[PDB]
Amino acid sequence: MNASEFRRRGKEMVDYVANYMEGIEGRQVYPDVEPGYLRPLIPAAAPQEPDTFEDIINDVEKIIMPGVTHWHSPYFFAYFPTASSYPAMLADMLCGAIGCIGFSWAASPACTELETVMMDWLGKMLELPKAFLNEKAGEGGGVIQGSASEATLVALLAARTKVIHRLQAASPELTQAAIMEKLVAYSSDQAHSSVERAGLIGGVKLKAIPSDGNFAMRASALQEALERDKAAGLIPFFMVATLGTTTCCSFDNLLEVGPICNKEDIWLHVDAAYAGSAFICPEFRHLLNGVEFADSFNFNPHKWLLVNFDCSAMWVKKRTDLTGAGLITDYRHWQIPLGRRFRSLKMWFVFRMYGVKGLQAYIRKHVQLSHEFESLVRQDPRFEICVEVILGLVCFRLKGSNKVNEALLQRINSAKKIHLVPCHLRDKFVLRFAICSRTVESAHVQRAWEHIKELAADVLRAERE
Amino acid sequence: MNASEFRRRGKEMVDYVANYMEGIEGRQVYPDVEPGYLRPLIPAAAPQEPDTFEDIINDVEKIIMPGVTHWHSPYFFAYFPTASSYPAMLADMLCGAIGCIGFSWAASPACTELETVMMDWLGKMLELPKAFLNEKAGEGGGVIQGSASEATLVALLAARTKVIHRLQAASPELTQAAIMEKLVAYSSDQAHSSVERAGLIGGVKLKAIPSDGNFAMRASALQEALERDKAAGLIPFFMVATLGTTTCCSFDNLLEVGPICNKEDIWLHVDAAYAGSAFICPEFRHLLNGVEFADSFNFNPHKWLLVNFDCSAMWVKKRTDLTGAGLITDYRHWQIPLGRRFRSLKMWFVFRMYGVKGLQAYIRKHVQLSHEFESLVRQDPRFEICVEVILGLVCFRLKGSNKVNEALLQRINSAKKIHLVPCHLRDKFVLRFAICSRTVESAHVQRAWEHIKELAADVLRAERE
Ligand SMILES: Cc1ncc(COP(=O)(O)O)c(CNN[C@@](C)(Cc2ccc(O)c(O)c2)C(=O)O)c1O
Ligand SMILES: Cc1ncc(COP(=O)(O)O)c(CNN[C@@](C)(Cc2ccc(O)c(O)c2)C(=O)O)c1O
């Protein structure tokens, strides 16, 4: 293609995208295809001569869309939201056009420099302690990671290098491998699987701290684990404290866990992948209190701050602690990959085109809708809410057996009107209702509950026979 | 933004992108800004109320573009090409609109299933051994990684897990840490820094194999290193053999190194980040002979196959060896991150809109232009070519001291008409000329050489005084 043909086809793509978005409520949210559906429907080899754009876009509708789960349908209530906004889409077109690989300052100065400023913009919107901000001064700063899973790995690796160097400074004869045998990392029993994966990749032991009745990590359980493992000869070195657990959006107590991690020389990484976006609202900022004790803090604008994937935001207090693993000129030693694209354009466009107040309104509407769903559940005594509703997630279930709730879930996902996923809280099977779509409204939440309520009656009937 | 506003602004963005691309030859390839230029030019905090699109796009031109290194200018001859094509741009708009996170089959079936087919399309274009292809049969298959640096890490981690399990099967009392002390990985002394980083992240020793006069890894040097390290008690477990080294586009000998790695139970990873795209042309496929001995093979469509970053293509012979670290339903255990976007749409669009013959013509034009530059250098006896020219890279220098070539480079990069970077080959400072832009032509290559030739005269004059 030349640029003149892209002028025509790019504008046709813009219309196609806007059409898909404007009609998305008419899409079945979860697909009917079975695993393996796609390969029989397209050729076994690439074409030798070019295909037409018309044939390709026809295949998008005919072959791709039947296998799409529509994350941005208002009836998608699964997992956590992922971001979809037109400002991020516009920036992503510009990002691909500039097309730089920012593995060094010289590879495109603006790619690195805009990113550092946007991470300070974001840090200030979250009212982060100044130690995390760059502002061309001090030792802290922020970087975009590809994902919170990668951000957790990066923090673990930095923590690993820091403790190896400290332990070898104390015992110069001590090998890296002898230290490796004794290192242990911690997270909540509600932590995301990215923590377990970081421990496996990092080659260290990982232990779950039992959570309290609110599924929060507390000082007492942490102290009990530390006493046990230190007596066994393990060396605590890394902690992931979670704000907004994937299971039930619970919150680890940083005011309790922070001081303990500091005094134990445990690198404290705060994972707020989903919940972090709400901390731009002052009524939720208290859930972040204690981040001043953290060594690193991470959350995903690409979940709940309208910056399309990929965009994970990570700050550290000491750049030097992170690199070994004022002006920031490159990010090579802040991330796993060397190459990176101009992702800060997406943050710039979203922040500027929505404004801080526009993002706050977006968060608050989602939380209000969550409370609307919760209100409906609390009116039906056949159901129970298992965890306090704070952000855009409601954990609910039919009172009674796990089997009846497994049946309810299977009826919901078989009817394919809405989409949600479950979790386990201890031995209890629980349904999750996550407010996801940028365009979801009260009417969608109410119809989803009406649907759930109807299927529950059929399921409860079948259990008495 | 709503969809109706995106219809208007998205089409204005398409025009802006096409304008930038059509005028790109008028851009100064390398910028005049100094590190730190950007922060004083934009506000210290995000705006509370929205800014206009017009103000944002004005800032792109006023503030961002002065800090852009124009990778896609025809006068960019630095590093290696990165991909920029309009089919990939169109697919990337559709990718952001579908906006799924494909961390599981259910999160969007098409996101995983198209990817597996495209990796077979690509594998067949490279005439890979069938053991690497999926085709819903056997044990092999391919995945998109975010980068070759990540692909190398993933292979090292899989190799690490495989050798730990084998050594523990032989000695059940042996701890992971005791094994960690003895593991050693290998690469060429010309290997990319991503290998050293994978070794650091993976917690294993890494040793460089001395390259021959053609900067290739050969059996003799590999055998000499193996005898030394095995006698010292090290356990060889991982090898990165490079096809198309970053320094001088040299090629490790897989026909020699492959059988050695197999008999030593060394996981052989073939890194062809840049050169791999040329292997779709039969006249270059012989440079890949011996990949049948590899356990994993990787190259970057986002360098030299017009699939905009990010898109790194990695194949393995045994999915089970990779996951522990027929139908493919998820890629969670193939990559470092859990989340991933619908990147295979970019491969689909590029492959279909260019056709295999269009991609072959693109490769061959770049190689011809490389040989055109080489021809000009070989006509000037003040210069020498340090390594055989095979693909789109020419390694050249003024005969004489490193200091005179350092002066030549500084004059080139100070005049800001073209952009190139150097390397070291042993103790020798060498200039690299890489054919990069999709729209580069003979006329650009000839003007670049005319420029280099002129600056060399001034530099040689200043050395005789
Ligand atoms: C609490 C928590 N911590 C870390 C991560 C990992 O984030 P990332 O995907 O960027 O590596 C998560 C992941 N949330 N995983 C979900 C909710 C799936 C998901 C939804 C929306 C997204 O934008 C992403 O990236 C993932 C899951 O089902 O596991 C997390 O919740
Ligand atoms: C031989 C070789 N192996 C691995 C890598 C790493 O690839 P990736 O960037 O995907 O992690 C490379 C990297 N090449 N690095 C260049 C040539 C910079 C560069 C140019 C164009 C790109 O598309 C990327 O991603 C990077 C460098 O200067 O180091 C490699 O050459």
UniProtKB/TrEMBL annotation, chains A, B:
Pathway: Catecholamine biosynthesis; dopamine biosynthesis; dopamine from L-tyrosine: step 2/2. The modification N6-(pyridoxal phosphate)lysine is found at residue 303. The keyword Chaperone does not apply. The keyword Lyase applies. Pfam families: Pyridoxal_deC. One of its GO terms (molecular function) is pyridoxal phosphate binding. InterPro entries: Aromatic_deC, PyrdxlP-dep_de-COase, PyrdxlP-dep_Trfase, PyrdxlP-dep_Trfase_major, PyrdxlP-dep_Trfase_small, Pyridoxal-P_BS. GO terms for biological process: amino acid metabolic process; carboxylic acid metabolic process; catecholamine biosynthetic process. Keywords: Catecholamine biosynthesis, Decarboxylase, Lyase, Pyridoxal phosphate. Its cofactor is pyridoxal 5'-phosphate. Its EC number is 4.1.1.28. It is an enzyme of class 4 (lyase). Homodimer. Belongs to the group II decarboxylase family. This is Aromatic-L-amino-acid decarboxylase. It comes from Homo sapiens (Human). The lineage of its organism: Eukaryota, Metazoa, Chordata, Craniata, Vertebrata.
